[PDB]
Structures are given as C-alpha cells and as structure tokens.
Symmetry: C3
Subunit: 334 residues, 3 copies
C-alpha cells in the first residue's frame, strides 16, 4: 500500500550515532534498519566479572536509530540460530501491538519485519519483551536501546529558536544483576538459561550489582572518553529501560534538558542534575565553555564511583579565568 | 455557618470512579462522602499469599472521591468496633491540621466528620496517619486512596482547549512488605498487631515483597481488565502514597500527562513513561488508536512482571495498518 | 584582573540562612566565603548511635551560601591539620574543573581559594569529591551543602509577578550508612578511616540506615522546629547530594515549586509532593494559611517516620474554619 521512498541506514555502535539531518527538507520516507540479536558472555568490569548478555546488534545499549516525525520505521529483526531463546522488539515510539512486541516474536533461526509510523517526537526506549517474567530478564540482560524521532524543523527551545547540536552521543545505562557465591565472588554461567534462576532471585530484590554505561565499567573513558571542544553544543541522549537514573555533567550543566525526553514539550534550562525515569530516554544539550576532563555520571555517587556509572569527556580549548579561577593554590594555613 | 446545598455521593470501588461532571454549571456545594474502615486478611497473589490489610471502604486503594474546585468535602469517617486499631484520615488536597489527621483520630467504635474546602485542583493522595511509626505501617497496609478536584470548566491543555475524557480509571499502586520464614515462604499472621513487628523490620529495609494495582497481583486483568474502544479518550489516575512509580502504557503513550498531578499546571505531551512521586497522585490521558491488548505497568519491569504491578486494557476497534504493520511474518532467515 | 567590590558574608548554620537581598540594585561583586572542614564523631539518633561525619563548617548540611546572578563567589576552603583526610569542593553552580574539585584538593594543614562566576540561577548542591571511591564516601559522610544564586530582580512566577519570601529555610537531607554488628547493633568507629571498609560495603548495597534532616533524627523539632505565622510566605530549599527525596508539607502544599531547582524555569503550582533528584537542590514556597503543627517529610513515610526524615513547623495565627473544620468530634457510631 505504502508508496514512499526507501532509505537504508547503516547503524553504528554506541555511544556514536549514525549520520542524520536535524532540520530536513525531505518528506516522509520508509527508513530501513536491521537489528541482529546476539546472546553472548561478556566482561563487565575491570576485575574480569562475566555476564550473560543479550543484545541487539552486539552492543549494550542497542544502537540509536534516528528518524523524523512522520517517517515509517521498517525494522528487520533477526534472531540467528546461534542464539538459544526467542526474542522480540517493543518500541516505546510506536503505536499498537505492545509497541511491536506482539508482532515480532521470533525463535532462533527466524526473522521478522515490522513497520511503525513515527507519530511521536522525542527519544524513546526500545527493548525486548517476550512475555511474562522473561520481559525484565531480557531487558536487564542488555536487550534495550533507543530511537530518536526529530521534528522536521529540528529542535527548538520553546521560546521560537532553533537548537542545533554539533554532535550527539547516546549513553545507555544498564542495571545488571550478577549473583555471588557463598565466598562472596561473582558467579559465572555457561549460558543465559543457566544464569536465569540465580539472576531472577537477585533481580526481585531490586539492587543491581553493577550500573554501567555502554555495557561495562569504564567503557566511556580513556581512549573511549567522549570528546568535545569549547564552543561545541553536544546533545547527550540517556536511556534506562528498567530503572531510574539522575544524570549530571560534573563541571557543566544541562543548558536545555528534556528529562522526560519528548520534543513536543519545551526543554527546561540550566539544570544541574536531571532524571531519567526507568523505561524512558531523555536528552540534554550543553555548550562547553571550559577545557579539561568532565565526568558524566548518575548522581547516586555510590552507583557512579562504585558500581560503574561514570563516563568522561575530554574537552579541548582555552581555559576561561572569568568563569573560574584558582585565586590561590593550596598553601599552608597562615 | 456554611449555607450551601448538600450533595451525597455513592462511592464505587476502584478502578471505577463514581459518576461526576467534568465541566459544570453548578456552584460550590457541600459534597458528602462516607468512608468505613475495614481491617481484614486478604489474598494478594496467585500463590495464595495472605496479607493483613487495613482499608478505607474495603478496597485497596480506597475509592476515588471526585469534586470541583471550591466545593467543601464533608467526610464521615467510621471506625467500627470490629476493628482493632485507631485510625484517621489525611487529605493532601486539604489545608490545615496535618491534612485532617489531627482532627480525625477515632478509636474502634467511633466516627468523626471532617470538612475541608477544595482550594487546590488536581489529583491528590488521602491516607491514614495515626502518628509516629504507625503512619507508614497503616499506609503500606493499604490505608490510602485519592481525591480528584476538577476545575469547574473541566480540564484544558494549557495551549485554551478543553480536554474531555470519555472515561476515567483509578489505578492505586501498593508497595507491600510480607516477611518470609526461614524456609523462604511468606508468613501469615492472625491479626495486624501480630504482623507488626516482622512487617516493620522488613519495611525499614525499603524493599517490597509485592507491588500491586488494585490490591492484588492480576487484579486488573482477565474479566477485570480495563477496557476502551479505538477513539476513546481515557484518563488514568495513578497514586502511590509511599513509594515512587513510573507508569507506562505498553503500545500507547501519555497524550497529556500531569505527572505531579495538579491541574493548575499544563500537561506535558506525548510521553512514553511518567513518574509518580511517592506520596502523590498523577494523571495521564490517552486516546486509543489501535485495538488489542495493552499492558499498563510501572516500568521497573521487575516490579511489573515479577512483583505484581501489571494491569491490562482490552481495546475494541479496527486495526490501523498505517500506524503499524507486520510487513513480513516470522520466517526462516534467508 | 577582576576589579569589582568585595563583600564578606558571615555564614550561619542550617536550617537558617545568612542575611541577603532578594531583588537588589547592586551590581556584580566578589562575594567572599570561608568554609572550614571538620571531621568529627557525632550522634545521629535518639538512641545514641554515633557516626563518623565529615563536614563543611561543622554542620550537616554545610551552610547555604546566597549570591546573585553574575556575582563571583570566592571561597577560602580550609582543611585544618586536625583532620585526617584530603578534601576539596565541587560546586554544581560553577563551570569548569569538575565544579572546582580539580582546583581545590587540600591536605590537612592546607587551604585554597577558588573563585567562580555565578552564571546559572537556582539552588545547587556543593560537595566534596576527592576522587574515585572517596567521592561517595565523603558525600554520604556529610560533606555537602548548597548555594542559592538569585536573579537580581528576585524570584518570579513565570506568569510577570514577583515572588517574595518572608523567610527561607535550608533543609539538607542526608542518607547515612551505619553498619551493624552480628548482634544487630549499630557499630561505632574510632576514626573515619576505621569506618571506611564496613561503611563502603554497606553503601554499595544502596540502603541507608538513617535518612535525616540537619544531621540527626529530630534535629528540626521541639525547640528547633521551623516556625512561621499565618500569612507568611516561606521558601524551603531542600537538597540531597546522593539520593532522591520526595518532600511534602503535611497540611500544606507547594504553592510555587522549582523541584529541579533552577530559576530560569517557571515554578509549578499547587503541588502536594515534589521530587529532589539525588545530586540536586530544589525549592518550594508556601504561604501559610492555618496555625498549628505541620510535619515536613520525605514522603517515603518509612524513611520519614522510621529512618529520621521528619521536620516540624510550628505556626502561629488564627484557625480558618472555612478552609477546614471538625464538623462533629469523635463520637460513638449511632
Ligand atoms: O519546544 C516545544 C514547545 O514550543 C512551543 C512554543 O512555545 O511550540 C514550538 O514547538 C512546536 C513543536 O516543535 C512547533 O510546532 C511550534 O510551532 C513551536 O512554536 C510549544 O507549543 C511546545 O510545547
Ligand atoms: O493547563 C493549565 C495552564 O494553562 C494556562 C494557560 O497556558 O491557564 C489555563 O488554565 C487555567 C487553569 O484552568 C485557567 O484559569 C486559564 O484561564 C487557562 O488559560 C496556564 O496559566 C496554566 O498553568
Ligand atoms: O520564571 C521564569 C520563567 O518566566 C519567564 C516568563 O514566562 O521569564 C521571566 O523570568 C525570566 C528569568 O527571571 C526573566 O528574564 C523574564 O524577563 C521574565 O518574563 C520565562 O521566560 C522563564 O522560563
Ligand atoms: O558533581 N559531582 O558529583
Ligand atoms: O513497553 N514495555 O515494557
Ligand atoms: O501527608 N502525610 O504524610
Ligand atoms: Cu530477548
Ligand atoms: Cu517498555
Ligand atoms: Cu489507619
Ligand atoms: Cu501524606
Ligand atoms: Cu571530603
Ligand atoms: Cu556532584
């Protein structure tokens, strides 16, 4: 029925985001994406703890999909025979059939093609949701990502002005539940199925062992720190499919923040810390003013420093002594 | 002193809501309600776990009371001699005397009549609050409900347009704390008083055993699923008197959401997931676009799927293939 | 370089706030503050539990600093040789160098002078953040306070009207993690260093033993209840540097609330309960209408009643029977 132009997107791994337009002169298109599910054992911390992950496209989070209002998003979801479990996909951006979940349940060896019309603007979670107790399990095993639906005129501040970002990053936060043995060491398992009983028991107690960005402690640091230059406006999309978070850029602010993540609402301005409700994505933009290292955290600092939820930015440019200066370096008290 | 017309309301059990006007040509009235407290042992899950509940009018949540701005709400609170504990009522909608709590403490065998002027619009929690450690205990035992204070002109979108709902449901969410024995089985108790010591010990650790809607796992499913038709605008009032929640309609959205619950503020639009602060009620309206089953959850999916916090909607009407379609059913990967 | 007038502030202990102007005709100044760090063992509850606290200026929270937009805040941070640990300060109001933390690390025996320009309006957390796992530890040991950056025209309602408070209080909420011995009694320690291992183990489990205002159970009660008169507009600044909170004034409302705490955004109106994201300060103003006792709580009522997070207001004036009246005192049921 649907006679619109087709455009393929090459997805890229988080925290990066596939190339896209903000404001566009294009009309509605059918935008084609492929997600291939991968179950895999991964390392989640610097001590070598392992984890039975379940992923879209091999990453935690799944990649960010970007379209415009009124596009049709046509996803080929692939569950190779090398996986063990059925899977599906639920888009919080979509209308009907449990977000798509009721139309996309696929066994290992199968694929399905779902299309949904992008009638709601904002950033939104997508996640697997097979049914029943498998829903939380697949999500907290890593099977969640996000999609961004931009207005065709790009972003605005609510107050008629365009808000154009120079770059965008996607920070997906994952609560993980790794059981411990009697000795107190984290357990390792041979399969997701073997991990399930212990993992569910822990899940129901509601306290994660790890809270990470991009799948692992320290993922968005060192070589893989986020970057910017003084003067650049950076959009940071943050999602959490199961559990609340409170993002904060240490040494910066949220200049324009959509904490509930939906562009039909004006952004709030000048925030210190914002709030991502579990089951949602939000977004914050900041124009960097100072060079140096920043930490981007959830501001439960226990989670940030001790459970894994810290990213860095390394920012280039000239220090601004008007905004901040060390008037007197550390010295002995007179 | 107060010479206004009197109107009696027949309360109805949640999730339903007693008949009322949205916009009205009536002026202020004294609106009369009766709440009769019932302490009772109830079943809270499909395994037969029992629970020492304390209720207004026999239900968890207590029933939704609906009035208009500037009405006077005159409540006869009754504590029959068949109960064991003192009780009272605190309305977050009311001004003075700890919300009414300091004027309504009644022993078994007593009743009291409190009137308060509805000067604040929105949805609001009411709950028992006897004093001290009994406050949390009575609340988490089930002694909470909500009241809705509508503008006399009905609801609006902030942007001069009326927002008229076709039906309203009240979802009261309850965190419950049922201790376990050494074997790991939930305990049963002969009285609320006998449950108290174990229950308080658990409460202070801040992790519920169950998180339910309408008093029990699965209460708002099967026969008792919520219903709608494609084209109907449904208001969903959600309250949580003690603990945060993050509502989400799976396959839908919050078209207009007052997550802090107060109609003096414009609604937010197009939300995926919203946030009910513990100690509050909020409200979301959605116009259904697709038939079929929806789940309405808190989007901590562990809580939703594993601890009890899932409702269903069954929606009648015609499927819209423009909004969503299964382009290719599950098939073997080529 | 900076040739502006200098003004010294004499800080005062919370919940009080040093004298300041709301609207002002002054231009930018360099506003001088001194904070002297004190590590000390304190009592945190009415049972005599002790706690290894780390403080700015001897108090939990640290004192509220008040300036205006475009002022420069020049803080002398002093770490006397009588302390054991290094410390620093991070202002969420400031731009660059991890909020100042990267420019203020001082060993016992040292002091440092940091200046930052107040370019963001609102209430903001400040806290110590030495590095790594020490960050959460110093914060949850008490090393956090707040700063308020007022517009030069004072506060407004977003809708061109001034919002002038008659008094302001600062409620700093502290999550505390005091381990228990095998017997189940809270442990005491001879030094912060000796407390660290047990305290970190508990911290990572994310459940506080105590949640207090102004450093101790019952701190803002009795002699030290907050006060008001009917007719007075009271601003209540609330901060939580590590963990969410949901403030509520029992028997009142938030007439004007900036829950995210930033004055570039209009306040919300008529709230029952608001939400302070961990890592932030927010503010609520209320004009008292009724005399008597109010409780100001976090509306996790377990936390409020059982873990320490209750303050009182004692309010003088004339009871308003229009707003609320006891129509019939407790009596036997007919
Ligand atoms: O930022 C969204 C917010 O801005 C307002 C204007 O106050 O509308 C702007 O954004 C809309 C969505 O992009 C545009 O359609 C509109 O033309 C533009 O003024 C609000 O209505 C909206 O909530
Ligand atoms: O939806 C509430 C929001 O709308 C505004 C207009 O932007 O006011 C509307 O609602 C008021 C409350 O019902 C009415 O009194 C008013 O006349 C109407 O325009 C905002 O002021 C308010 O925050
Ligand atoms: O309350 C802040 C809110 O109000 C608006 C008007 O709707 O702006 C007012 O506040 C600004 C900050 O103090 C002033 O600069 C402005 O002149 C005044 O109208 C909004 O723009 C703002 O979000
Ligand atoms: O801003 N520091 O946690
Ligand atoms: O929207 N699904 O959890
Ligand atoms: O408002 N009482 O918890
Ligand atoms: Cu899956
Ligand atoms: Cu979901
Ligand atoms: Cu009671
Ligand atoms: Cu209450
Ligand atoms: Cu310190
Ligand atoms: Cu911080």
């Amino acid at each position: 029925d649907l006679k619109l132009p087709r455009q393929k997107v090459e997805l890229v791994a988080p925290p990066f985001v596939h190339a896209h337009e903000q404001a566009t002169k294009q009309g509605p298109k059918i935008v084609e994406f492929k997600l291939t599910i991968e179950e895999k054992k991964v390392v989640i911390d610097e001590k070598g703890t392992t984890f039975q992950a379940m992923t879209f496209n091999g990453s935690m989070p799944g990649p960010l999909m970007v379209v415009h209002e009124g596009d049709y998003v046509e996803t080929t979801l692939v569950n190779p025979a090398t996986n063990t479990m059925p899977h599906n996909i639920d888009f919080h951006s979509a209308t009907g059939a449990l977000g798509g979940g009721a139309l996309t349940l696929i066994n290992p060896g199968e694929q399905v093609v779902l299309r949904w019309k992008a009638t709601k603007t904002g950033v939104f979670v997508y996640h697997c949701a097979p049914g029943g107790p498998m829903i939380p399990w697949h999500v907290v095993s890593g099977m969640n990502g996000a999609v961004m639906v931009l207005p065709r005129d790009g972003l605005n501040d609510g107050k008629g002005h365009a808000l154009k970002y120079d770059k965008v990053y996607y920070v997906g936060e994952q609560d993980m539940y790794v059981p411990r043995d009697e000795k107190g060491n984290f357990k390792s398992y041979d399969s997701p199925g073997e991990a399930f009983t212990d993992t569910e028991e822990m899940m129901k107690k509601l306290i994660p062992s790890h809270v990470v960005f991009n799948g692992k402690v320290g993922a968005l640091t060192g070589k893989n720190a986020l970057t910017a230059n003084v003067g650049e406006n950076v959009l940071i999309v943050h999602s959490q499919a199961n559990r609340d978070s409170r993002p904060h850029l240490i040494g910066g602010h949220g200049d324009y923040v959509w904490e509930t993540g939906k562009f039909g609402n004006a952004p709030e301005v000048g925030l210190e810390t914002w709030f991502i409700r579990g089951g949602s994505a939000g977004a914050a933009m900041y124009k960097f003013m100072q060079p140096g290292i920043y930490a981007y955290v959830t501001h439960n600092l226990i989670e940030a420093a001790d459970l894994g939820a810290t990213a860095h930015f390394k920012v280039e440019g000239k220090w601004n002594d008007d905004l901040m200066t060390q008037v007197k370096a550390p010295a002995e008290i007179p």
